[PDB]
Structures are given as C-alpha cells and as structure tokens.
From a paper:
Interestingly, [name] has been identified on the cell surface of [name], enhancing the staphylokinase activation of plasminogen.
Moreover, the structure of Sa_[name] in complex with [name] was also determined at 1.6 Å resolution, enabling the elucidation of the interaction network between the enzyme and [name]. [name]-bound Sa_[name] crystals were obtained by the co-crystallization of Sa_[name] with the substrate 2-PG. On the opposite side, the [name] phosphate group forms hydrogen bonds to Arg372, Ser373 and Ser42. Although [name] is a metalloenzyme containing two metal-binding sites in the active site, our structure only displays one bound Mg2+ ion near the [name] carboxyl group. As shown in Fig. 3(d), two [name] carboxyl O atoms occupy two positions within the Mg2+-binding site through coordinate bonds. To the best of our knowledge, the structure of the [name]-bound form of Sa_[name] constitutes the first Gram-positive bacterial structure solved with ligand bound and displaying evidence of catalytic loop shifting within the active site.
Author numbering:
A (entry chain A), B (entry chain B), C (entry chain A), D (entry chain B): 1 to 433
Write the structure that this text describes.
C-alpha cells in the first residue's frame, strides 16, 4: 500500500559534528525510508541553499531546527493531505520545488527538501523489495564506479606550501570494484608508513586523508607515486592520479596566484601560464583527472584548458557548474570541461540530480557522484552511481566511516549484482579518446 | 515465521581502512538483521581472539576471509540445518561457543561469532517490530547514557609529552541526552578554535578527537577546561573530565615510568606514588572517572587506588578485566575498581556481553559500553547501553561518523522513548557515594 | 495490530475468599491478557493503597466494586481514547499514575492500576508471541529463582509460644529449579509425618504451611531440621533455613518484647540484645536469610544487625522498605539490609516494580519477588523473577494452588528455557561474601 | 488449521504438593489447549487407574514420569501420525481407549489419557474462538450450577467425634451464581469468626474448609446453621445443608459403626437403623442432599434410603457409582439414589464423562460435576457443569485457589452469558418432587 502516511524530520549530527537534517518516510503498508543530508565545507554560488538557524546559543548558529520544522509543519502535511504514492518521485519533487517557490530552495531549505526527496525514494525501494540502484535506474543499473580516492590535501585544507586543494588516487586498472578498494587501501596504508618514517603528520582531515607538511606540489605527487609503487602497483597503468585544484580559491584579478598558499616566491600565473602549467604536470605525471583547474568564472581559460588536454585528461567542473543544469548546458554548448561533479544537496532533489546526470551523459561528459565535507551514515550516493552507470564516484579517502560506509555499500552492490556486475576500469572514461 | 533461513557473511572495511566481518541474517518471513564487527585483537591470553588471514598479498595480512568462510561454511549450516528460531538468542550463542570449542573463540574467530550473534538479535527485533533496546532489555529499557567523549589524546596516540592515552569530557549536568550531545559538540568546536589560535594541530585521530602538542598533562587538562568554559559550561558541575591512563603501556618492573612518554626528566613512580599522583589530580581538577589508572596486573595498586579515591571517582577496568567475567568476579571479590569497560567483541557474543553487564551491575559497578578504535556504521552499542539502563557509554569524540552514528542512534532512541526517556546525569554514577 | 481496544475489570475472589480485581486487555488484533491482583494480610505504610468498598452489606465491607468501576469508567476510556499501543508499558503506567494524581494511588486504587498494568504486559507478550519473562526482561532473562518456602508459622499467624512469624526452607544446593521444588516438597511431606506422629496439627494456613503448637522457637527450628534430614538432605549445605521475624509486630517503646507471643516469661530485648540474639541463632543453625529482623523504624538497629551478620546472612527489608524506592534509596545510602521483598501490589505498576528491582540490584542487594497472603491463580510473579534474573522468589509453602501455581509456572519456564536455563544455587546470594 | 501438530506432557504439582500430569496440545494454526489432571486412585476395581511411578527416591513414590512418558512417546505419535483434527474429540478419546486396551486405563494411565482428552477439547475451543462450555455443550449451554460448598469436615478428615466426612452449604435461593458465591463466602467468614470465639481451629483442610473439634454431629450442624443466620440468610429457604457421609469408611460386617469415629459409646447401626437415622436428620435439619449415606455395596440399604427420603432429598452416589456407566445403569434400573458425583479423572476421557452425565440426566438423576482432593489451577469442570446444564457443582470451600479458581471461572461464564445466563436455584433439583 504505497500512499505516504508519515513524513518526519529530526536534527542529527554530521561527520564534522555539525547539525543536519534526517527524514523518515512511511507508507500505509509500513515501507520505510530514512535519509540524512550532507553539508559542504564551502559552497559554490548559483546553488540550492541549506537553511541554518543562526541561533548562536545552539551549535554556534549551525542548528537546523527551522529546516526540520519546515519538513514537519509544511512539507509533511502537503504530502499526507495530497495522498501521494511513494512511487511518484517526480511528482513529489516537483511539488516541493513549487511549494518553496524560490530558485534556490531558500524558503524551505534545500536540506529540508532533499531529506524528503531521498527518504521517499528509499521508502519506495523498500515497498517494492528492490535494490535502491534498480529502483532509481531501472533493471540495467549494474556498473560499479572507479573511485577517486582522496589521499593528500593542500590549499586551504593544509598548512603545507601547496596551492592545490586535493590529490587523489584512482585504481582504474582493477578488474572489480572490490579489488579497486583493496588497492586503494593498501596504497593508503603504505603512504601512512612513508609519512611516519619521514616524521610527517598522519592524523586525518574531513575526508579521511592526510595533510602532511610536504615541501611542495612535486614532493606531494612523487610521494604518492612512491606509495603506489611500494604497495606493488603500476602508476599510469593500474593506478592514476587526480587533482582538485579548487583554483577559484587562489584566483584573483586575472591571476592564478600561487603565492596565496605557496609562500612569497609562489608563481603568479596568467590563464595562459596556468594552462601551460597543468599541461606540464599531466605530461610529467600520470594524471587522469583535474577538477576546477581553472577559475569558476574563467570560461576563456576553461576553453583553452579543454582544447589543450581535454582529449586525454578529464576536466571536472565542480565550482564551475554547481550541479546546475543551466550552467552545465552553457558549458556543453561552449566546449567547457568534459565532466561534472554531482552533489545531490547542491541541487536539492533526486529528480533534479538525475536530470543533471542525464544531461551530462548525453553530452559525452562523465557525471561524478560526490560526497561533501560534512557526510553522514547515509550511503545513497553509492546507489545513485550504480543506478546511472555513472562509472565514477568521489566519496573520500580510506578512513572514516563517513567515507568507508559508501565503499562498503558499493561492496554490497557488487556482491548482490554477482555475475551481472561490471567495472569498466579505464573504459569508464568514455569522455576521453 | 521466525526460523532462520539464511546466514551470510562478507568482508567489508572498518573506520581505519582495515577489513572486518559483516553478517546478515534472514528469517522465513523476511525479517532481516545486519551486523558489522569492530576491531579487536588476534592475540591475548584472556580475551576472545579475532581471526585474521595473515595473507600479506591482501590488506597487509589483515583480511578476514577465513572468519567470513567460517560463518558461511561452518556456522550458517549449523544454524539453518538446526532450524533455530531467530528469537532463541542464548541457544544460538551457546551453540556457537560449543561449535568453536576453545576458550578464546580462536578456531572460528570471535569476529565470525559476534557477527552472527548481533545479526540474529537485529533480525529478531525486526521480526517482532520492536526497538532493539526493548527486544534486548525488555520493556523497561529507557535510560540514556551519559557519554564519555574523547577529546584529547596522549601516550602512544600522540607525540606530545603526556603519558595518559586519553582525556574525555562528560556532560553529566544535562537534562537529556540530546542536550548533552550539543554541549559536547560545542565544547569540541571551542577547543578546536583554541588549538588553531595557539598554532596547534586540529586534524583528528581514530576516535575523532585531537592529539595536540601540549606542553604536558596540566596544559592539556587546563586547555580542555578553558574550552568547557568558553562554550558556556561549568566544569565540575555541568561537565566533568575523564582519563584513560592506559597505564599498562608505561608500567614495567614495578615502576610507572612516565619517562616513556614525557621525556628524560619524567617521573618514575612506584605504585604508591602513582596512587598519590592520581589523587592529587582528582583533588586539583574535576575528574569523575579514570580508566586503567593502575597496571593490568598490579592488583595491589588497584586495591590501594580504589581505597584511596573509589568512593568519589569512578575507576574503570579496561585492560584490567578485558570483558571477562572470571576476571571481573575476581575484581569484585577483592574490591578492585568500581566500573568495567564492556567491549562486545572482546567477549564475542551478546549473551556473554549481557552476562558481564549484569555481573557488574549486581556488584554495584557501572558497565560502560564501549567502542573500539576500528569502528563501523553499526550502532548496536547504543541500543545495548539503553537496553541495560547502563547509564554510560564510551563511543568517541564529536567527529567521524564511526562515532557520530552512535550518538545519532541515541538521539533516535531518546526521541522514540518520548516522555518515558530518562537521563540521570550525575545520578548515573550509582557506584559512587 | 497493537492498539488497545478493550480494557475490562470484574470482581473475583482471592485465595482467602475475599474480593479482588481482575482485568482483561484486548488489542485490535485479538491479543489478550488477564491479570488478577493479590492482597496482603497486613500492610506496611508508605505504600500504595488498595481500594475497598466498605459496604458492610457485601463481603463484610471487602468488595472491590469501586476499583472495578474505576477501571471500567475512568482508566479504560483514557487508554482507548488515547489509542495507546499495548507495547507502550511505561507510557501507560505513567499515564495511570498521573490520572490518579496522588502519591499512594488512593483515588483510583492500587488494585485498579496494577490490574491494568499487568494485563497490558500480558497482552503485549501474547501479541508478540513471546514468553512473558522475555517480553519483560529481554532476551537474557533465564535465571530461575531459589525459592524460599514457607513451612512453619508463628507470631500472629499461630497460637504457639513463638514470636517469629515465619520459618522457611531454601533448597539452595539443587542443580535446577525442578529439583529444588522436589526437595522442598519431600521435606514438607516428611515434616507433616513428624507432626502427625507428635499429635500436632497438620491443617494449613494462608500460605499452605503449618502452624503447629511447638514448645518454642528452638523446637520449631530443630523439628524443621529433623524433617530436612529425614527427607535425606543436608542442612547447611543442600538446604538452609530462613526467618520472617516480622519484628515490628512485637516491638514497642524501644523493646523487642517476646512476651507478646512467647508468654509472660518471654524476653524483653533491647536492640543490642536483639542483634545478639539473631547472631546467636545464625551461629547455631543454618540460617541464610532473615526478613524484618529489626523493627521498621529501628534504623540504628538495622545498621547494627547489618554490620554484625550482613556479610554472611541475607537481611531482607519487607515492612522496612514497602517496595518504595525512596525508602530503599535511603536504606542503600545508610548501609541498611542487603535485600528487599518486592510486592508488585505494594507499589502498583510493573514499571515501578521493575525500577525497584533495578535499584536494588545496582546496589548489590537481592530483589526477592513476593506473594501476598491473599493470592490468586495469577502467576505473573514467576515471570517477573526470571525476567530480572532476580535469583530468589518467595511464593509459599508446598500446598495450595495459590502457591503451587507459581511453582508450576517456574517449571514451565525452566522447561521452555531448556539448555539455556540456569539455577545458581548458593551463588544466587551475590549480596553475601 | 485444525490438524494436531504437537501433544506434550510434563510433570507438575497438585494442590497437595503431589505430582500430576499436565498436557499441552497445538494445532497447525497455533490453537492451544493446556490441561492439568486432578488426583485419583492407582487401584480400584471399577474405576480408571492413575499411574504413579513408585520410585521412592522421588516424591515418595508419587512421581508421574511414566504417565508423562506414555503421553510423549505413545499417545502423541499416534495422534500426530494419525493427522487427527482437534475437533474430533470422540475419535481421539476412542483411539486412546483402544490404544491402552484395558478396562481401567491401567496400561497408559487414566492420568495420561485424561490430560490429552481435556487439552484437545481446550485447543478445539481456542481454534473456533468459542467459550469452552459452548464448544462442549452446544449453543444452549447456559445454566450456572448451584454450588455445594464444603464447610466442615469430619470422619477420617478430622479428629472430632463425628462420623460423617463432610458438611456443605448450598446457596439455593440466590438469583444468580455471582450472588450465590457471595452468600457462601459471607457464611464461611461468619463461621470462621464463630469458631475463633469458641477457641476452635480455623486452619483449613484439602478442600479449603474447617475441621474443628466440635462435640459431635449436632454441634457441627447447629454451628453451621448459626453461621448461615449470622450472615443474614434463611436456613431451609435461602441456604440448605448437605452431607458427604462417606459411609463406606465406617461400614463393616453389616454394621454402620459410628464408634469408629465417635468414640466407644458411638452407635452401631443396622442398615434399617442407618436409614432411620438419616431420615431423623433430614426431618430435624434443612438437609437437601446426602452423598454416600449407605455403603458402596449395600444396595438393599440404598434402595430403602431412596424409598424413604428420595422424593425430597437428593441422594448422591460417589463411591457407589465411581463415575462408571455400567454401575450407574444398574443403579437406575434398581431405583438406587437420584444423583451421581461425576469425577472426570475417575473415568478418564471427556467423551465418557459426557456419556455418564447424559445417562444420569435421561434417568431423571442430577449429575454433580466434582473436584478431587488434589486439585490444580485447571478450571475445566466449571465449563463442563455449564456445558451440560448440570445445575450443580461440588468444587470446594471458600478458600484456596484450587477451589476458588473454579468459582472465578463460573463468575466469568455467568458474566459472558450476560442476559442469557440462568441460575435455577431450587428448581435445579429436578430429581426431587
Ligand atoms: Mg571540489
Ligand atoms: Mg582503554
Ligand atoms: Mg513479611
Ligand atoms: Mg465423596
């Protein structure tokens, strides 16, 4: 019996110890779904906005009681009085969008809306007795993603003289996701040993990776490569590197100003020099993906970067696109990037999330389903990656259950799929030559 | 409906990126339970042994394929062919204990056995439609625990000149668990700010807390107190401190050798001087609980410590008791400690876990249900704490979902209990007079 | 379907031929529970009070039509209109406590309230298909009690020159409850034969035991020991003795006045001499438990008694505590007694009963679940003893179904538990050295 | 649904502390019945034999492990392998009779057979959702019995100089059973007061009544009458007396020898003088019923007694008929008595019990459904009395739950019947003119 009979929100905590929204949905027959909403460390703009309370007497102003109230007192009665079927996902998502009535979900909160959106879908899958990836994506959802695994952090997430925010490993050469996960974990533990022996810090950041005091970018990259090799894997064949440059954080007045993070002698690069520099790095090192290599508003620079190395390196828009199909469409039309980081809570409904993934795919772009800095015990993004046969995921390093829970769910999905599972390895990069 | 029809194990990852056991149980009617096992020890004279593979080609020898196979090929057929009801928890636990046939669960593995033990109970609660805490503890399970929250680490978990392994905060004075959690989180964020302003490290360890380069024990303690106050709480009334001294890690040849961690000039204390020192600390600072203040084999020293401050300070045996009712019984008979840290995987079944909690309670000891360093997305320990009205829990700092998931489950339990919930605050320490 | 749809009370008779309350509860799905309420011969004060009609035209004023009406016309509609789930025991108990609104349950009657409280729990266990002890106590309720079996009566329950109200046997050395019951029964029949041969009376009193015209206390005790030995059992190893002194019934103006029951030459003992006397008896005879050895208000005397023999003899507060957690807490804080007699109807709800048991256990006291002088065909107290692993029960001699029904239910519980049952024998006395 | 899937026996205790048989029956759908068997006789030419173990190491040889084994190992597999419907009562009873194959049920035991017989019927009523009296007797079972209530005992059940075994009160003049029960209880308590004031014993015997040291038969009778009046009732209109003379216990060699119980001067009466004596008593006192007034083999004396007073006094055969339809038929044919005491366990199946009741009724005799000295918490005889509209029951005095449980069940039956219940009072004696 599919009619939704209860929609209930509560305030819980995320992986950084900040409040977030949890929603539970029940049907008449007792089918049940629970969703928890993630939260970003920094937000691109043109984005759906999370509602926070700003009551400095609670949680330093980061309470989400208003968003919770919006679910319990506004959204819930609309759903229950409307006698919506739990199966009518698009109808419910459209209803919430209209109920809020603003372009950025700023009245009810993207956190209120997404909690309900995901909890409904989870309840629907429970009702049908379907794996969530098959409910979401249909019968042919079967492709496990290549994980891009955080390993070293820089920029504003570190004190080392390194401008790029994040360095990742990608176990592209593995034959299964289960194997890929083991490779990454082995490399992580090997790097930890290397860091310890060098007297560098091995405590972890928000994503479960390291932020060691390397000498600079080349030291960081070569040390990761050292770990890959020590673990017994082949860089540039079995395991590749990725960056999240987060270049907007050091771009100002037409200059990519590396002195912001790399000390007084750090290079001040024009957009042309920035492209040259990224090209030099991908020629020197086995780098298969670069996120936000150019500034969020530097469309000319993005075009040049894409013309320069886009045939052989994935170029992921994060801050560039902010999971916004209007911006994505503009990107596609202008030959900008070849991949998009998909953040469910940046847009705020599952319907819109899937629309963005579909738009990307139909343009020959990859859609990389992503975590946020503040995660939860929710593992829905694992199922979204498989539902859409996305082929890639970005969900953290190899420690902290806020990351590992997603990897464990991918293990379960691959196990359940059995002989029907596929892991396409390097062929996951259908956006590249 | 209740006959178990499937028992299935798989290898997943824990919060440190090490393999562990997951088990799923199904009944004929489709009731379902999933358990994940936290990290343990593969050796240790008096505790239950986790089984690891030792295949250095996988996960550096830390695979759990053998334990998984033991579930799938040995335990599962015994259960299924035996037509055990999912409700017959004690029967199933006793059967597994006999099936392994060794005192330390070293044949099948405590990790195999506990995975099944917990998954069965979770499936039973699902079958009955009961909250797990009520299934486990009966109708009167209703007391939320005071959380002892990791905040600063020392000893072998840090590079600072501090011998004690862990410092904790306890929001004893809160009126509800939900408020207690907020207090702790606010204190955590305030400490983080204080550390940053001092130029100390704010990256986190395995339990989600900090390991800053303090000048020593007094600096650490006073800085935590500073954070408590900055967050707006009263030390020694609303919020107390706790230690895990892990004193076995610096005791040798009859000496508590603080020079092991606190540099060349660090004190070498006899057992008498160790007791004097702990007494001095509890007289100076608002310390309500001390774990492993004396060495695991220094029973004479434990007795002296208990006589000295046990009337007004909780004295928790962890390494002292290793969740072993034979050792606990010896402790009780000899007036040793007044609390025990209860680690489900250290004993290996829910039945034995509950027996240990009950033995402790009936002696006027508190039973503090505990996490391990390697945790998972499992939240069963939250329900165990409420089921037994234990009154205390030790499940980590205020970051990392491996910890926060337990706190979120306690929020859900308190919410569900509604007007029947109780949080006893300082009266939780029924072991103190 | 757990919502309570009917709550119905009727006036029935207890084992002494006095009216009492019966309540039946039904759920929407047809789950059913029936409870009957016991009644004491004499009442301690500070107690929940039973409501009687005082209509001397019916049952000599002992009718319970008002209490029955209070269930049918006040409590029942509150429950039914409230749509309470039969599983929400604590909520329903708290609701009734508030509905009555007085400290002693004197408006609605403790008999009205307890009838509903127990019938609800019985219906809940029926709904879930659980044994009542597992519903009440959770999965680990498995310990059968050592029974303290009435055998000889004195004081105001006899015409013999004996001040103590009750003498009991305890089959502590048996390996199972089933064996323990047989031992007691054999001893009972042997005593009956001994009494008959001596020309003493073998008719029974309210609890199913004897009140023979012995020469005094030593005659009674030695004759019981004679019966134990004649039955082939070892006094002070296999079978121990117990007293219920009911000392309040002969204490006045600071004197334990044995002349009240033992004739003109009976000793008038100070509190100090009373302690000396009880100590002498426990040194001479295999006495393991003494109930109400000191007067209900003689706290100094209780303290002295507890210091004197409390390490090796159980000291049970009955009139001392009147199943009142405020009085119990005061006792615990002052080192008074080491056991409490738990009378469900003296407090009036299952929630409060369990709270009292838990408070006792967590203080290292035993909780002895008890009958009343006026019993019924209800056997709930058997399930309460096992639910809480209490380890002891006091439910009568070895005749009269008002007593034997409880023993039969313990047989069924032990049978059902099969290999999971435990009977701890002497180790049941965890309150003693 | 109705096929019997489990038949299980266990050894429990009766109201005298002697072992007896309990049986539980389950159907495929979970319908459930439990029966307990009352005390019987292990020898006796014309009745069904209870089987006892004779192992003097257990319960003084009174164990029923063999009868229990006969159920579990012989009867149960026949039923289960036979796929008998729980509704097929007569088939099952006939099968057991044939399975035992002896006239007195001495191979399997009448206690084994009756336990199964009753448990089956109780399970059938549960399956159908019918009150047991309607299942047993059809839609028109509605007549509550006049209770003949034990109050004073003599003969071998007392030490007083009184030959008759039992004196009873019968609240014939009440308008409902519920009122009749109150009358009896009030009389019982009034007698107790009278006895206490006279310094006579008020402890109770097996049936819950008194055995005081009266001066003789007239003292006993007149004192009971005093109690009736003191309670406010009219002897010989509202409340009548009954005897159980148990005359076989003092008849030998053609003489009713009252000197056996009434001292050296007690009358030695011929059968003619015995009839004269009983006639004198019924002329002097309001006696409506006499059980076993003549010896079990004195058929000529029974005939004379019946001719003398049978038109106006009920004459109940107990030892005369031993619930044996062959003996009853002989009695009917010869004009012997006008009532039979029906003891379910004396014949051993419900089918045979109902056949005996029917034979009696069709002869214009009353069938008085009876307890035994050793009773249990079973209340089936209450339902049998109503099922057959018997109009009378003999189930004990007004104390002990072994008796009171039956009266409570009659209260429930009358309550359930509501406006359809009937209590025929004096018209219940349809055998008298
Ligand atoms: Mg980014
Ligand atoms: Mg520790
Ligand atoms: Mg008492
Ligand atoms: Mg008779």
């Amino acid at each position: 019996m599919p009619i939704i009979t209860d929609v209930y929100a509560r305030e819980v905590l995320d992986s950084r110890g900040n409040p977030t929204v949890e929603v539970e949905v029940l049907t008449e027959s007792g089918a049940f779904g629970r969703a928890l909403v993630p939260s970003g460390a920094s937000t691109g703009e043109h984005e759906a906005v999370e509602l926070r309370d700003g009551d400095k007497s609670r949680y330093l102003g980061k309470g989400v009681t208003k968003a919770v109230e919006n679910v319990n007192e506004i959204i819930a009665p609309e759903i229950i009085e409307g006698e919506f079927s739990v199966l009518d996902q698009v109808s419910i998502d459209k209803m919430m969008i209209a109920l809020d009535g603003t372009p950025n979900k700023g009245k009810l909160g993207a956190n209120a809306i997404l909690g309900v959106s995901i909890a409904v879908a989870r309840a629907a899958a429970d009702l049908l007795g379907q794996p969530l990836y098959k409910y979401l994506g249909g019968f042919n959802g079967k492709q496990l993603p290549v994980p891009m695994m955080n390993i070293v952090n820089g920029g504003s997430h570190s004190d080392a003289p390194i401008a790029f925010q994040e360095f990742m490993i990608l176990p592209v050469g593995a034959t299964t996701f289960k194997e890929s996960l083991r490779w990454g974990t082995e490399i992580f533990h090997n790097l930890k040993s290397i860091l310890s022996k060098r007297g560098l810090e091995t405590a972890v950041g928000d994503e479960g990776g390291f932020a060691p005091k390397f000498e600079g970018t080349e030291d960081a990259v070569e040390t990761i490569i050292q770990a890959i090799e020590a673990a017994g894997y082949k860089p540039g064949e079995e395991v590749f590197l990725g960056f999240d440059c987060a270049s907007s954080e050091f771009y100002e007045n037409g200059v990519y100003d590396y002195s912001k993070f790399e000390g007084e002698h750090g290079a001040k690069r024009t957009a042309a020099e920035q492209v040259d520099y990224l090209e030099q790095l991908v020629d020197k090192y086995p780098i298969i993906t670069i996120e936000d290599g150019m500034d969020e508003n530097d469309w000319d620079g993005w075009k040049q970067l894409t013309e320069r190395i886009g045939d052989r390196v994935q170029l992921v828009g994060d801050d560039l696109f902010v999971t916004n199909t209007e911006i994505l469409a503009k990107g596609i039309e202008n030959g900008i990037g070849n991949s998009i980081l998909i953040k469910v809570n940046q847009i705020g409904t599952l319907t819109e999330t899937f629309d963005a993934i579909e738009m990307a795919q139909k343009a020959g772009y990859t859609a990389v389903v992503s975590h946020r800095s503040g995660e939860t015990e929710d593992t829905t993004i694992a199922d979204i990656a498989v539902a859409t046969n996305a082929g890639q995921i970005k969900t953290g390093s190899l420690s902290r259950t806020d990351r590992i829970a997603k990897y464990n769910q991918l293990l379960r999905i691959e196990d359940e799929l059995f002989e029907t599972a596929k892991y396409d390895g390097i062929k996951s990069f259908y956006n590249l030559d």
